[PDB]
Write a protein that holds these residues in place. Structure first.
Motif, PDB file in Angstrom:
ATOM      1  N   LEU C 232      -9.911   5.509 -22.257  1.00 49.88           N
ATOM      2  CA  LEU C 232      -9.824   5.402 -23.860  1.00 49.88           C
ATOM      3  C   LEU C 232      -8.288   5.781 -24.208  1.00 49.88           C
ATOM      4  CD1 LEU C 232     -13.159   7.434 -24.187  1.00 49.88           C
ATOM      5  CD2 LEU C 232     -12.838   4.843 -24.117  1.00 49.88           C
ATOM      6  N   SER C 235      -5.253   3.636 -24.088  1.00 51.69           N
ATOM      7  CA  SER C 235      -5.217   2.593 -25.265  1.00 51.69           C
ATOM      8  C   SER C 235      -4.847   3.258 -26.498  1.00 51.69           C
ATOM      9  CB  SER C 235      -6.510   2.002 -25.242  1.00 51.69           C
ATOM     10  OG  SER C 235      -6.915   1.350 -23.931  1.00 51.69           O
ATOM     11  N   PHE C 236      -5.582   4.528 -26.898  1.00 56.80           N
ATOM     12  CA  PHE C 236      -5.266   5.235 -28.087  1.00 56.80           C
ATOM     13  C   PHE C 236      -3.661   5.643 -28.112  1.00 56.80           C
ATOM     14  CE2 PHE C 236      -9.773   5.642 -28.193  1.00 56.80           C
ATOM     15  CZ  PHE C 236     -10.239   4.944 -29.410  1.00 56.80           C
TER      16      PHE C 236
ATOM     17  N   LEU D 175     -10.144  -4.524 -10.870  1.00 54.70           N
ATOM     18  CA  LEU D 175      -9.966  -3.154 -10.379  1.00 54.70           C
ATOM     19  C   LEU D 175     -11.044  -3.041  -9.012  1.00 54.70           C
ATOM     20  CD1 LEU D 175      -9.750  -0.205 -10.359  1.00 54.70           C
ATOM     21  CD2 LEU D 175     -11.429  -0.017 -12.185  1.00 54.70           C
ATOM     22  N   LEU D 244      -6.924  -3.932 -30.058  1.00 56.77           N
ATOM     23  CA  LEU D 244      -7.300  -2.935 -31.156  1.00 56.77           C
ATOM     24  C   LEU D 244      -6.138  -2.602 -31.972  1.00 56.77           C
ATOM     25  CD1 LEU D 244      -9.108   0.099 -29.287  1.00 56.77           C
ATOM     26  CD2 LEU D 244     -10.187  -2.039 -30.409  1.00 56.77           C
TER      27      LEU D 244
HETATM   28  C1  LIG Z   1      -9.301  -3.865 -18.793  1.00 56.63           C
HETATM   29  C2  LIG Z   1     -10.096  -2.917 -18.483  1.00 56.63           C
HETATM   30  C3  LIG Z   1     -10.601  -2.010 -17.509  1.00 56.63           C
HETATM   31  N1  LIG Z   1     -11.467  -1.401 -18.422  1.00 56.63           N
HETATM   32  C4  LIG Z   1     -13.123  -1.690 -18.376  1.00 56.63           C
HETATM   33  C5  LIG Z   1     -13.884  -1.087 -17.422  1.00 56.63           C
HETATM   34  C6  LIG Z   1     -15.144  -0.769 -17.593  1.00 56.63           C
HETATM   35  C7  LIG Z   1     -15.981  -0.054 -16.822  1.00 56.63           C
HETATM   36  C8  LIG Z   1     -15.175   0.673 -15.594  1.00 56.63           C
HETATM   37  F1  LIG Z   1     -15.901   1.625 -14.867  1.00 56.63           F
HETATM   38  C9  LIG Z   1     -13.872   0.607 -15.510  1.00 56.63           C
HETATM   39  C10 LIG Z   1     -13.046  -0.215 -16.441  1.00 56.63           C
HETATM   40  C11 LIG Z   1     -11.426  -0.589 -19.287  1.00 56.63           C
HETATM   41  C12 LIG Z   1     -10.122  -0.394 -19.916  1.00 56.63           C
HETATM   42  C13 LIG Z   1      -9.568   0.154 -21.022  1.00 56.63           C
HETATM   43  C14 LIG Z   1      -8.177   0.415 -21.367  1.00 56.63           C
HETATM   44  C15 LIG Z   1     -10.817   0.887 -21.825  1.00 56.63           C
HETATM   45  N2  LIG Z   1     -10.217   1.617 -22.775  1.00 56.63           N
HETATM   46  C16 LIG Z   1     -10.485   1.197 -24.265  1.00 56.63           C
HETATM   47  O1  LIG Z   1     -10.866   0.150 -24.455  1.00 56.63           O
HETATM   48  O2  LIG Z   1      -9.533   1.606 -25.290  1.00 56.63           O
HETATM   49  C17 LIG Z   1     -10.151   1.363 -26.251  1.00 56.63           C
HETATM   50  C18 LIG Z   1     -11.864   0.805 -21.386  1.00 56.63           C
HETATM   51  C19 LIG Z   1     -12.910   1.547 -22.090  1.00 56.63           C
HETATM   52  C20 LIG Z   1     -12.392  -0.036 -20.123  1.00 56.63           C
END
Ligand SMILES: C#CCN(Cc1ccc(F)cc1)c1cc(C)c(NC(=O)OC)c(C)c1
Ligand SMILES: C#CCN(Cc1ccc(F)cc1)c1cc(C)c(NC(=O)OC)c(C)c1
Ligand SMILES: C#CCN(Cc1ccc(F)cc1)c1cc(C)c(NC(=O)OC)c(C)c1
Ligand SMILES: C#CCN(Cc1ccc(F)cc1)c1cc(C)c(NC(=O)OC)c(C)c1
Lengths: 144, 339, 339, 339, 339, 144, 144, 144
Positions: C232, C235-236, D175, D244
């Motif tokens: 999180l 991204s923020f 990933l 976002l």
């Molecule tokens: C693309 C990609 C990776 N993932 C998905 C993911 C879901 C479950 C996991 F165990 C691992 C990864 C991901 C990436 C970001 C930047 C965020 N943050 C965000 O959304 O900022 C608002 C989130 C919340 C998930």
């Protein structure tokens, strides 16, 4: 229109050159080539498509007279030609100069002979700094 | 008969090679893989561990690549004959005069020299081959139709020169100032910030968010200043990426719009051509035949033009709308005159 | 004769220096390189390894820079005479009163003091020179026409204060919370997370994606929490960069729109001026000459105005459209009254 | 006289505190600095090196903060009397019932307990104080008018759930797959990739571009796979930030549009109110006075409404345009009927 | 009576499972957590430290998951009977023929085999279980309605192939060139840049801003070149992320627009259906009843259609606007003819 | 129009001051300067371009009479002046106040003398809170 | 209009209650308050601004009669009221129901008494599922 | 309209089949089902909503005659049907072919019987390459 129908039938006979009453792609192509113009089969197919309405691959004389009797002058043609001129009218002022018009006529699309371009520019009064309104031209074409 | 099929296949090969579209690109894609299949192999050739296996595979792939590129070259020159302007020996020579064709032939002879050298195995020939292996990326250089990518990048940079210069200026100021302040607060406690150049390297590696970690602030004041200034610097260093992404999108949209408008140019000229042909239309049998051909050509040109005049964009449709509006304005004024 | 050419070249130099456009910028670009040619050299002067070579090259480049900047200064003051408001000794003094001109002269005398000090070689003069070497970035500060970049940045920040504050608030909360939780789950197992300040430094270096690696979570629970919260936080923390990039694009587009509209202001005023001139037009020979001049000025002003009234934007064109629409509305109502 | 000025200053303080606008925010900004002046100091209090100086400065700043917050609290409660709904003791009690007012008072008494504890110096009181120091961020929590930032974030996430879910799904797959493959090609050569969890940590720290460097691929095949998969993963992990950012911009623009439209609601209702007042208007002297007041109120309401009806957006202006167009359509049909 | 409620609950379960909307997703969300509750646990099972606790928790969660998934499977097959096309044993078989249903059953039997193997505890069964634990992500694969995410990604990539290819080409050139130059200026001073492959790894890890720090430039010339080229490379490597984010937003907006337009298709067809029903409407009592039913169906269809014809976009509203404009054009021309 | 043509020829003679029958850029510039107005060569070139249509670099008397006889009052001029006024009409309400109008007249473009600005404001009824509709002005200009 | 002018002068005398011939902000405010309505000084200032055109801070009787004699019914008022109704017309169908209309009348802006809202709904035929066209209302207001 | 009112009352009696004078959702549903059409309760509720205006849950005969006497032919219906046709008119040229029209009629919405689709295509002159203007159809529906 009996004289008109007779002339149309005579022209159809000249085209087909036989009693089939129909003109195929090759039949049209041979007569077109006889004038010395080097066509392409693709545009012959497009042409027969654009004339024939039954979709049978050849032109029937009833359709021949049908899309003959229709005169060129139409409001649809009016606006189409107006917009075609507009595409070349810089600033959309309704005025086209006698320099870019000659170039587009001679070069773009089916290139026109220079004598024909001179005929075009001399058809209407070029006076007025060389800018002539294409609207006068569109009306003249409408008159037919 | 025979010539028709010959020129048909010739045109098909020319437009699958020189003017790719759709499935043609697959062929290009394939050779692109082979292109990488060269570069990567040669990179692995540098590694002393895999130099033997990499060298063997690279020789095999170099033979394969030379065969493929020779086949492409001879296909291309033979297909150049399709157009009249380049039909005959004069046409082949003229095509060989093109910069991309000569680049292709020079890379081809570089490849053949590479193969002959590897067969010889001379030590100087080894340096020759390492030189001539980078000569293969010029295939990618030739792939783009005269620097489309470079033109797009330059146009986007110029179009957004204001924002880009703002971001560069502010980010550079942040870099200079933060590096200087961290240097000041760490020139003594931390050994890696011994000189201002070291601090500048740290600032560049930080604000770009690379963060190697070789140089990091140690004193708590240094950590605080570095964090505070990095918060601004990372954003100002990431700005150009976003600005260029938006500019790329906008620029390509504008190019698509302009291409769509240019699509009208030829059909409109054709329409005017056939319109005047029909007008000038008005032996008598032959003249009537000419009238018929000219009027039906007018019909087909009108069909094409009206087909291309679909409104691509809101702006274009509202512009046609305003043409109609001015037309209505004139009509309603004429009416009010009549009343 | 002589004065005409003199003032012509004077105006050309003034508009290539003070109001650059197109190729003029190249000259500026050139000096900008020299500007870097100073700064970078001085940075290398800090390095004890290259201090000798860097110092020699910096002395040569400082002489060159002083010559170039003196030439620019005397060109600029001489060219200031072009305008009447700044013609004569009073004009030269008035131009010297401008903040940027005095900044240029102060940096010039800083440079000459630097050269004289280097010739002297005094130890205090060394500190003086290191101080006066940063005095050269103020040329860049003067390059922008009164903080255009700063104004753009501030306007964009203000325009997007809502999104920016949202991103800052949420990202700061994520930083605080994640740092605290990682500290809790690693305050003992990991030595580098000994205090909460250490965890805060780790969180700042992580969420910004700098990732130095000096502090990294070790316990598997710490790794899991750090990954989850970093997902999180990254991204923020990247949000402000994208928000500012979009704002920069939007802001510059709006500024371009407003400039295009202001381009109408002068031609429209000219049009009204000449319109009333012609109206008031209606010895008799001299009066007729005045009528002719006023009416032809009206014609040229109308030409300019109609030239500038091309629709820049969909909004502008639809606004002119709605003016025409209201006009039609009145006409059709008048017609229905007549019927 | 006295009451007029009293209520004037009361309203001024209420709208500079509870409904900040423009310069009012400066005051808030000031206290925000003090807010940080607390948090940061307390963070430094954790550091054992500066715990003494940090503790002294934090005690001074805690006294200052308690004074400032008590003054703000008593100003706020006194200013609540401005409105009739909250005028008198009942009004003060009602305002104290608000969640933010009780949060302010609870943080205030937490601060006073902190001060008393520091004066006492009990060991349990130390834990109490470290607990009550985080109680100061709730001022920031109270600053936003009922989760404006959270509402904006949630609305943007929901609006773009499609793209966000696409990015999350694809990035998560990248990933998982890349981590697994690197684990496979390095489970033995590299000790840090001993287990799949280690590879997952590496993948998370890589694709996010944090790149700590504690775990890095060593085998050349591992390096190649890691680079290839990271090229996709870094983009897919950066996608949510850009999505976002764009959503934030769009959402705030839409909220501004809706607020501008709601600005019309009150003036339009006022216009209809006064319109019917005037209509119902038609002692006789008193009735005529009523007619005059109602008609002039109609005039002012019409002025307001027409003022607010400026076209904010192209969509709004074209919608008013289409209302006019339908009106014209009816008129022209009526005309054609008349002819 | 009984059948009505039976089919009502059947449809409710079918549309909460196979066609989730709103609160239905919560159930899915719940199972998604359980999905992670499996994967994460199994990942922790890899860790030798927590292998015991992780294995116990994973066995408990595997039993729970098998129960939940069996319940979902039998609910789903039973609810498939709701539709006539899949009512009866033939319908159950037909639903079992769907790829997602067979994928669900194969993962279910993989889970039951996992449980039986864990009960047995055979060493080969351990490998079997580690294989069958990745068989649980296919639930996520089945969650999306036939690759919506993949389709969106591919469509966006294709739509922006120009910008993406430009960015990839330029960034790849920057990577190659910068890596080569840094290799040249550090092939000897720095041991980690021993071969060109090492420099390529460094360049990839730098320009992506991962910055592991295992390889970093050491020579000052190397540092300068690396910084200069990284400044361009980081932007060109971040470009694809921004391009894809913008493309995602645009693509989803376009898909929403097209869905809104398709919403018109069914109501319009219904409107035409009932229109001709009413037209063909014109025992006599029964025929009059038919006329009444057809005309009132016409009314309801017209209500629906006019409801769906609200202008979603500026383009759509201006297109309806231009239809009205052409209508007006014809009317005004007819009028001018009449005059 | 014989009297009108005679007056136009007399004015042309006053302009050229010779029998050349043409007025060059310098010929126009000298006579314009004689009134004491300090022109600029660039706008003389633009002016001769905007008058001369033959593109020969000088003005022929036939063109002189051609673009004389054309009266100012035209619908094109009507809309052009209306829009020129609109550019200064805040809110597009058709009303301009007698304060910003004076400033724009005196300052923007070719600056006007204060007495002339007073003449402008007093030309039409300023009553009505100082807001005067520019439409009345446009009609008055149309009348000529 | 002699009777009308006499009535207007009588009303002006009632307003000012003195021979000043002018009504200041306080003079209007006192008489407005006498009816028991609790005004606000700000809207008194806005009101005197919207009536007085000389900008002298008070209302002169000539302006009083000027902006009296002007009748409410105007096309400008027609469109303004139509759009004011439209702002509350969901879907822009020209029809407003007798439920949200009552709420907006009683609550939004200067709140109206419930009896007045009942008067509004009963003024026109509510029949037709409760949806009444506001256009009939706008015409009725136009009639005056 | 006495004969018309008598026929409407007879049809109402056939519908309700009792002296209640009202038709509930079930009352309409049973008679609709008797024709063998398999309705759905939801559209019965929507239907009674779209007919009944009092909101009492059933249809009163006064409303029955009210929304009977209203003839189908209306300008609102004219434009609604025109736009419904347009949604299927590719390129917005006013012409629909007799191939996609048949498919949309038979498949989309309440599917129509193939014989009915043949009736549709044969209702108007399909000649002209299969493209028929839907405007002629809209006018024919208007005629009623
Ligand atoms: C693309 C990609 C990776 N993932 C998905 C993911 C879901 C479950 C996991 F165990 C691992 C990864 C991901 C990436 C970001 C930047 C965020 N943050 C965000 O959304 O900022 C608002 C989130 C919340 C998930
Ligand atoms: C913001 C900031 C830093 N600067 C400005 C800068 C200028 C001179 C310096 F010596 C150091 C820094 C900067 C940042 C980036 C990402 C790039 N790359 C780029 O534009 O990609 C297209 C460039 C070219 C400059
Ligand atoms: C999101 C997030 C973190 N925050 C908010 C924050 C506030 C106070 C703190 F002590 C720590 C963090 C943050 C992030 C960035 C990128 C920036 N830089 C920037 O805006 O570039 C223009 C800033 C200025 C703050
Ligand atoms: C710019 C740049 C580098 N390149 C091009 C490149 C091509 C071949 C190479 F061997 C090395 C580099 C690059 C960059 C990124 C972020 C991605 N990932 C992506 O597109 O996410 C969707 C890809 C797939 C390629």
């Amino acid at each position: 229109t009996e004289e008109q129908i007779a002339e149309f039938k005579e022209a159809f006979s000249l085209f087909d050159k036989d009693g089939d009453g129909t003109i195929t792609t090759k039949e049209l192509g041979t007569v077109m080539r006889s004038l010395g113009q080097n066509p392409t089969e693709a545009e012959l197919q497009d042409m027969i498509n654009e004339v024939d309405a039954d979709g049978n691959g050849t032109i029937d004389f009833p359709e021949f007279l049908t899309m003959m009797a229709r005169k060129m002058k139409d409001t649809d043609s009016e606006e189409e030609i107006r917009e075609a001129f507009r595409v070349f009218d810089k600033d959309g002022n309704g005025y086209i100069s006698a320099a870019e018009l000659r170039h587009v006529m001679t070069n773009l699309g089916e290139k026109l002979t220079d004598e024909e371009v001179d005929e075009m520019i001399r058809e209407a009064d070029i006076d007025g700094d060389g800018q002539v309104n294409y609207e006068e031209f569109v009306q003249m074409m409408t008159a037919k | 008969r025979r010539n028709v099929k010959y020129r048909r296949v010739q045109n098909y090969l020319y437009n699958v090679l020189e003017r790719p579209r759709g499935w043609a690109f697959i062929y290009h894609a394939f050779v692109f893989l082979l292109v990488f299949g060269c570069l990567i192999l040669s990179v692995f050739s540098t590694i002393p561990e895999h130099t033997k296996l990499a060298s063997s595979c690279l020789l095999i792939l170099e033979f394969v690549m030379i065969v493929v590129f020779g086949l492409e070259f001879i296909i291309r020159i033979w297909s150049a004959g399709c157009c009249c302007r380049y039909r005959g020996w004069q046409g082949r020579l003229r095509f060989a005069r093109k910069p991309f064709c000569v680049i292709d032939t020079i890379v081809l002879i570089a490849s053949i020299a590479v193969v002959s050298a590897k067969t010889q195995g001379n030590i100087f020939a080894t340096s020759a081959l390492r030189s001539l292996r980078f000569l293969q990326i010029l295939r990618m250089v030739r792939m783009d139709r005269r620097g489309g990518t470079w033109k797009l990048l330059g146009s986007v940079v110029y179009a957004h020169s204001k924002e880009l210069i703002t971001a560069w200026y502010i980010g550079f100021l942040v870099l200079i100032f933060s590096s200087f302040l961290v240097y000041l607060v760490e020139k003594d406690a931390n050994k890696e910030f011994s000189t201002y150049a070291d601090a500048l390297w740290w600032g560049t590696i930080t604000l770009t968010t690379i963060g190697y970690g070789d140089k990091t602030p140690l004193t708590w004041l240094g950590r605080l200043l570095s964090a505070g200034f990095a918060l601004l610097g990372i954003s100002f260093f990431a700005l150009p990426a976003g600005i260029l992404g938006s500019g790329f999108a906008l620029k390509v949209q504008e190019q698509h719009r302009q291409k769509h408008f240019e699509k009208r140019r030829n059909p409109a000229a054709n329409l005017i051509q056939c319109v005047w042909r029909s007008y000038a239309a008005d032996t008598p049998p032959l003249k009537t035949v000419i009238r018929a051909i000219r009027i039906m050509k007018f019909h087909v040109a009108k069909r094409k033009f009206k087909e291309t005049l679909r409104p691509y964009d809101v702006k274009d449709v509202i512009e046609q709308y305003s043409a109609g509006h001015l037309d209505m304005l004139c009509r309603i004024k004429s009416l009010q005159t009549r009343v």
